[PDB]
Symmetry: C3
Subunit: 105 residues, 3 copies
């Protein structure tokens, strides 16, 4: 396995998604943050089935910066309990991983 990771997270709108991405990148806690706006999420919250528009984010980072990234997002997110799921990366293109690794703190 490579040391790269892809962290999934959602935001209520593009404005908040962009602000969070900019903060994370300025702190060098991710190499690239990709936003997928216009998503819809369904889930139960306090006993009711909700259906809300959200932005699905993908934070591309590495294991050496994993906890710092999670902690940062958790403390700079509009939601109290944001989605934060780390996907492992089994392999990647050498040159891309090189760039990803070099971009981080």
């Amino acid at each position: 396995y490579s040391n790269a990771i892809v962290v999934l997270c959602t935001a209520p709108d593009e404005a908040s998604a962009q602000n969070l991405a900019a903060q994370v990148l300025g702190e060098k806690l991710a190499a690239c943050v990709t936003l997928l706006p216009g998503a819809t999420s369904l889930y139960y919250w306090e006993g009711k089935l909700e259906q809300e528009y959200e932005v699905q984010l993908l934070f591309k980072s590495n294991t050496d910066h994993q906890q710092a990234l999670l902690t940062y997002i958790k403390q700079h997110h509009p939601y109290q309990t944001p989605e934060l799921l780390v996907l492992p990366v089994r392999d990647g293109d050498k040159d891309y991983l090189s760039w990803l690794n070099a971009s981080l703190l």
Copy 2:
């Protein structure tokens, strides 16, 4: 590795995607279902290259509910052979994982 999983699946349109998600959620087989509408999928089917609009779904659940979820979607999907790929989750925010686990059957 945490016990969380993210299941990839596609649906032909938002209406079918929403119905499936609502059903899975009511059955408590996923904690959150995110729909990414307006995607385009290319693939060969019966020897012909097809290019079709689809909704990419992400079902956020755990390994304990993995088989029931897969079986449920398979039996309640518009396609005869739907995409069902389980991505493992290496780690996550504990508060989020706690809510995810608590929302399941």
Copy 3:
């Protein structure tokens, strides 16, 4: 773990993403390619924070064709150093996995 994989990659626009997908599929190096257009990616490039539109791609393939797929994309991509991250697949629907494998043999 199954032998399936999901490879993340981004393209600058739909035209280029579609051409790449078609080429990869003709070469039988992926069973299905899903395009998520209208995404926004933020990243530092040459010291400056960029915010650009991209298409997020998901190549659904197997470990048996993983290196050939990565090499092929790298040689047929508009970017000099494109994003190429391989996500492992823990499990999936038997019929879907069978179709994916058969499509590439």
